[PDB]
């Protein structure tokens, strides 16, 4: 794995995945990471990361999770997986993904 | 202090014996480009030797039997291990101070590589005799990173070519400089030529 970039906003559905006990936690996951998007230097660094991924990587896999609030199941913790992106050049794969 | 040897053009067993002896003596040895190691005898013979080794297996539970590594670096490492007394603390320490790689990783891409003329194919084998390439042998036995290493190696080769051209220009410039300042530096060129450091 070369680099991992997350979205600015991640729903509590996916946040539940990161905790073994969501009832006793403070829900602090990504609370300090989310600030990389709203700051000028942070988003400049993010664009630098995207440029590095564009110029170095070979296969691009996108992270997506199911919406479990639309289901009759008891559990509310979303299932997060990696789905590979197949297509043209790495640059346009990354552009489509972003 | 670390002995770095370029494996391209070397014979497997003869290089391994010297590596094992040096490592027992106490040097830290890194063997690089293990896909370029040669073995005497034709490819079909060598691959049947390795296929018989592959057939060797523990009947009761194969997961506990011999481990048949497919990487050329691991093949060389296992040969050295067989030449070492690896069932003792001394042999294990020797194996620890030995390090073996495939291709040329970039701690060592920028360092000069040594060769061992006692274990070179062109010196030890008659030109009419046949030989085999360890990279091809490993690929046909099950190694899965032959092309990746080739592309990375051609990248390294292009970068090294650029560096070598720059160095050639630089030291040609140095020779021009010495020709320029020979009038001033004659007082030392003569005392070096009278002791054999020059020409």
């Amino acid at each position: 794995t070369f680099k991992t970039v997350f979205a600015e906003h991640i729903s509590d559905e996916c946040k539940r995945r990161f905790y073994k006990n969501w009832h006793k936690s403070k829900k602090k996951a990504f609370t300090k990471y989310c600030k990389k998007w709203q700051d000028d230097a942070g988003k400049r660094q993010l664009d630098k990361d995207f440029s590095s991924m564009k110029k170095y990587c070979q296969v691009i896999r996108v992270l997506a999770h199911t919406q479990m609030r639309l289901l009759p199941l008891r559990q509310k913790k979303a299932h997060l997986m990696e789905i590979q992106v197949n297509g043209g050049t790495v640059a346009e794969k990354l552009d489509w993904a972003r | 202090q670390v002995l770095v040897l370029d494996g391209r053009g070397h014979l497997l067993g003869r290089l391994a014996a010297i590596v094992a002896k040096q490592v027992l003596l106490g040097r830290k040895v890194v063997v690089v480009r293990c896909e370029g190691i040669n073995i005497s005898g034709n490819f079909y013979r060598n691959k049947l030797k390795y296929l018989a080794f592959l057939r060797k297996r523990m009947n009761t539970n194969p997961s506990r039997g011999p481990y048949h590594f497919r990487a050329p670096s691991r093949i060389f490492w296992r040969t050295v291990r067989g030449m070492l007394p690896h069932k003792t603390k001394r042999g294990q320490a020797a194996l620890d101070r030995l390090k073996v790689f495939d291709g040329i990783p970039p701690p060592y891409d920028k360092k000069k590589r040594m060769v061992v003329p006692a274990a070179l194919k062109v010196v030890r084998l008659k030109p009419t005799r046949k030989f085999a390439y360890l990279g091809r042998l490993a690929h046909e036995v099950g190694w899965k990173y032959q092309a990746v290493t080739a592309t990375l190696e051609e990248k390294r080769k292009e970068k090294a070519k650029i560096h070598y051209r720059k160095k050639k220009q630089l030291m040609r410039l140095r020779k021009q400089a010495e020709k320029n300042v020979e009038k001033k530096i004659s007082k030392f060129t003569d005392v070096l030529k009278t002791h054999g450091l020059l020409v």
């Binding site: - | 410039l173 400089a177 300042v181 530096i185 030392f188 005392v191 002791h195 054999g196 450091l197 020409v199």
Partner: protein, 138 residues
């Protein structure tokens, strides 16, 4: 393509063995791996000598394939092989190596002190040339 050949008359340099560092001439070829050599003006008797301990030079002097000591000697003196070999860069490198081996401690200190300044000056002028090339290329 080859440039040096083992024929009758070519002089050769003895790399190792008893008569190492001396020049011999091929007088006759005995077999695949043995030759008859003779140094008349360089302290080598007529004897069989293997090809493995010799290495040819770019000098050929003419005598019959079974000539005698006097005739080989006169051909050698006519050709002036001693002076030509002394002029040769091969012998220059040989004697430079000998002199460097013979160098002593005081000579080592002298050479160290001299090459310190020689490298310093050459490095400074190299920097000057780099600056000139950079300014003319920018």
């Amino acid at each position: 393509v080859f440039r040096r050949f083992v024929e009758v008359g070519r002089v050769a340099y003895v790399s190792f063995g008893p008569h190492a560092g001396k020049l011999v001439a091929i007088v006759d070829v005995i077999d695949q791996n043995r030759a008859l050599v003779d140094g008349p003006c360089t302290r080598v008797r007529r004897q069989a000598m293997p090809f493995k301990c010799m290495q040819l030079t770019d000098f050929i002097l003419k005598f019959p394939h079974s000539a005698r000591q006097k005739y080989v000697r006169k051909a050698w003196e006519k050709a002036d092989i001693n002076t030509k070999w002394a002029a040769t860069r091969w012998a220059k490198k040989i004697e430079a190596r000998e002199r460097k081996a013979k160098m002593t401690d005081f000579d080592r200190y002298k050479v160290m002190k001299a090459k310190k300044m020689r490298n310093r000056i050459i490095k400074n002028e190299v920097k000057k040339l780099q600056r000139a090339a950079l300014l003319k290329a920018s």
